[PDB]
Amino acid sequence: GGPSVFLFPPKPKDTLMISRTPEVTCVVVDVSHEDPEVKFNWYVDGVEVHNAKTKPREEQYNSTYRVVSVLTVLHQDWLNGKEYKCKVSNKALPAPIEKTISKAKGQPREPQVYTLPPSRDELTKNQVSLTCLVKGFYPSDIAVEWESNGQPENNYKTTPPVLDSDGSFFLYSKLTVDKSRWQQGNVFSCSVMHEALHNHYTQKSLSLS
Amino acid sequence: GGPSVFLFPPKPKDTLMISRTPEVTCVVVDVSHEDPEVKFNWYVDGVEVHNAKTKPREEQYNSTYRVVSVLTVLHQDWLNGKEYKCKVSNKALPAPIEKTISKAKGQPREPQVYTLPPSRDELTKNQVSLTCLVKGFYPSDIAVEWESNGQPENNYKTTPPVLDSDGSFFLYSKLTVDKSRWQQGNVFSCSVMHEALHNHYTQKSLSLSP
Amino acid sequence: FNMQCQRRFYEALHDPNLNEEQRNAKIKSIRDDC
Amino acid sequence: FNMQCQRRFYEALHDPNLNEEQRNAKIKSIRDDC
Ligand SMILES: *[C@@H]1O[C@H](CO[C@H]2O[C@@H](C)[C@@H](O)[C@@H](O)[C@@H]2O)[C@@H](O[C@@H]2O[C@H](CO)[C@@H](O[C@@H]3O[C@H](CO[C@@H]4O[C@H](CO)[C@@H](O)[C@H](O)[C@@H]4O)[C@@H](O)[C@H](O[C@H]4O[C@H](CO)[C@@H](O)[C@H](O)[C@@H]4O)[C@@H]3O)[C@H](O)[C@H]2NC(C)=O)[C@H](O)[C@H]1NC(C)=O
Ligand SMILES: *[C@@H]1O[C@H](CO[C@H]2O[C@@H](C)[C@@H](O)[C@@H](O)[C@@H]2O)[C@@H](O[C@@H]2O[C@H](CO)[C@@H](O[C@@H]3O[C@H](CO[C@H]4O[C@H](CO)[C@@H](O)[C@H](O)[C@@H]4O)[C@@H](O)[C@H](O[C@H]4O[C@H](CO)[C@@H](O)[C@H](O)[C@@H]4O)[C@@H]3O)[C@H](O)[C@H]2NC(C)=O)[C@H](O)[C@H]1NC(C)=O
């Protein structure tokens, strides 16, 4: 067989907010119980770097092993196309495995946010859904969140980026609330974080006139 | 080394509309040139069947092979949880590979359909989006379409079912139109087909009213 | 589509009166009928 | 979250006057400041 490798990109919100810390993660699965020594080699646009933080291996219930190296990156570097290569070297492997990832190439496109109130037919229920349509953005890397009264509402579920017919993406975010909170006229806001948004952020409120 | 196998379920609409013909598909990749013989064996809840239609292999561009067998199924049978096992036998196989798939288990839940008109902020554009939130259904097998004036509208795009916090799924369908058609008061319908819908069908209309 | 066949189908499929055999038989008939 | 650091960050990020080296430097600074 052979241990396997998967390279994971940073979280959209991590690359956009200067507060957060974006990291590219390198995972190694099917790591042999007898030859568990795993060595990582990280490279940015060719040049090797050494500030990756490798975590202690861990036997997986299927009696194998799993090792993970986390490379912290620069929001700019990721946003600027820089390429991140992870090179895994192990015994049970003829030659070190290599995986490379970078941000999607292509003209970014500022997203448009629209807040839709619940359908009338839904007011018969005890909870109603507030929708936040986010369309025409690119690349698909994006982060949607809801809040009210400054506080974050967490009972929401965003769909994953869907490719539209014009080559851009669009998704929808459904926040679920108590009819009571809604009809009471409270104000909710859908915030979107994207690279093509001024200051990588925007908001749209939603309530009952 | 040895051929790989993938079993694909029928299309939601094919198991729900009595018109169509639902089929489970067995695909085999990695067949070898000198070791090219593929034998399929189909089973429904254990019992073998012999009405699968195997297609002519096709030498893959990556120098390997791809053979497919299509088994026509019974709408009911699938909708009832029957199990479809495909058994692929080849020489490069120590032992025949088996794959089984069936409808997702769990109590069906009737989807709720709500139509949302465009956001006000969108009326500054020449094309607006008519949204169709479909929620709380189970299983994820579902089919949404749009229409108007009895005719089907095709400039829409549906999101894949998303797992909600209550174990059920929900999705959204965005039909895009010319502001003119919408403001002119035309009436559009979002139609949903699901096993948990009376007659596997339902629709909700959307137009101008304000 | 032929909403009537879709109805006869649904009906059959959920007829608590028939058994697997009868069901399949009744469904099939609606299939060929349209 | 500081709405100000996000502003200085976006700012520095698209400053057409700074080069890769300077930008990094200016950005890092914004990072350490908050
Ligand atoms: C031994 O057990 C390992 C760990 O298993 C535990 O965790 C889960 C995986 C469950 O199985 C659980 O029951 C076990 O306790 C197995 O590791 C997995 O191995 C598979 C096979 O390669 C990996 O599959 C990949 O999955 C990713 C999805 O990534 C997800 O990321 C999140 C974080 O963001 C993780 O938290 C999730 O767990 C996922 O890992 C895919 O992106 C990736 O796709 C690519 O390869 C496939 C190959 O066909 C292609 O089809 C695609 O197009 C892509 O190219 C791939 O499917 C999975 O990530 C591993 N899980 C972990 C935690 O690393 C191991 O496989 C198993 N081995 C044996 C012999 O049993
Ligand atoms: C030889 O070439 C075959 C064809 O390759 C494709 O891509 C390029 C490179 C060309 O060669 C083209 O001819 C062709 O388009 C390879 O076959 C492919 O093999 C992969 C696995 O190696 C198969 O992946 C599996 O696909 C399932 C879904 O695929 C769907 O999408 C494709 C294209 O959109 C359709 O053709 C299919 O009909 C399907 O609709 C997917 O479900 C599988 O899931 C994987 O992940 C889950 C995670 O849990 C895991 O459980 C599962 O086991 C899989 O790991 C999987 O991704 C792919 O279907 C197959 N393609 C076709 C067209 O059959 C062949 O590998 C290659 N071999 C070599 C040695 O080169």
Pair of tokens at residue B180: 């003119």
Residues of chain C with a following break (C to N over 2.5 Å): none
Q: How far apart are CA A160 and CA A182, in angstroms?
A: 26
Is A69 within 8 Å of A54 (Cβ atoms)?
Answer: yes
Is C24's CB within 8 Å of B19's CB? no
CA–CA distance, A177 with A154 (Å, rounded to integer) = 10
User: What's the rounded Cα separation, in Å, for the pair A2 and A93?
Assistant: 6
Q: Is C2 exposed, middle or buried (0-12, 13-18, 19+ CB in 10 A)?
A: middle
Which residues on neighbouring strands pair with residue A84, listed in sequence order? A44, A101
Type of residue found at C18 = L
Q: Which chains touch A (3 or more CB pairs under 8 A)?
A: B, D
Neighbours of B140 (CB within 10 A): 16
- Judge whether B74 is closer than 8 Å to chain C, CB to CB: yes
Rg (CA), chain D: 9
Q: Are residues B169 and B161 in contact, defined by beta-carbon separation less than 8 angstroms?
A: yes
Fold for the domain defined by B3-102: Immunoglobulin-like (2.60.40)
CA of B28 to the centre of ligand 2 (A): 10
Q: Which residues pair with A26 in a beta bridge?
A: A7, A69
CA-nearest of B10, B73, B49 to B40 is: B49
E strand intervals along chain B: 4-8, 23-29, 39-44, 47-49, 53-54, 58-59, 65-72, 84-89, 97-101, 112-116, 127-137, 143-148, 151-153, 156-158, 162-163, 169-178, 188-193, 202-206
Domain boundaries, chain D: 3-33
Q: What are phi and psi of B80, to 5 degrees?
A: -100, 5
**CB within 8 Å: B159 and A162:** yes
* CB neighbour burial string for A35-74, b if at least 16 within 10 angstroms, e if fewer: ebebebbbbbeeeeeeebeeeeeeeeeeebbbbbbbbebb
Tally of residues, chain C: 34
Torsional sign, CA A49, A53, A56, A59 = negative
C24, containing H or E segment = helix C20-33
- What's the one-letter identity of residue B16? L
B184 to chain A, any CB pair closer than 8 A? The answer is no
Q: How far apart are CA A194 and CA A201, in angstroms?
A: 6
Tell me the three state secondary structure of residue A134: strand
AA letter at A146: W
Q: Indicate where chain B has its CATH 2.60.40.10 domain(s).
A: 3-102, 103-208
Amino acid at the residue B58: E
CA nearest to A39, candidates A51, A54, A24:
A54
In 3-state terms, what secondary structure has residue A167?
Answer: coil
φ/ψ of A114, rounded to 5, equals -135, 125
Adjacent-strand bridge partners of B129:
B176
B11 lines ligand 2 (CB under 6 A): no
Smallest Cα–Cα separation from B65: which of B32, B26, B96? B32
Pick from C1, C23, C24: CB nearest B19: C1
The answer to whether the CB of A179 falls within 8 A of the CB of A208 is no
Domain A103-208 has CATH 2.60.40.10: yes
Q: Specify the experimental method.
A: X-ray
- Rounded to 5°, the CA angle B141-B142-B144 comes to 160
Q: Measure B25 CA to ligand 2 centroid, in angstroms.
A: 14
User: Which of B164, B136, B130, B134 is closest to B148 using CA atoms?
Assistant: B130
Take residue A137 and report the two structure tokens written for it: 């953005």
- Among residues A165, A56, A188, A28, which one has the least CA distance to residue A118? A188
What part of B 77-136 touches A (C-beta under 8 Å)? 112, 114-119, 121-122, 129, 131, 133, 135
Count CB-CB contacts under 10 A for residue D3. Answer: 8
What percentage of chain D's residues is helix, strand, coil (to nearest 5)?
Answer: 75, 0, 25
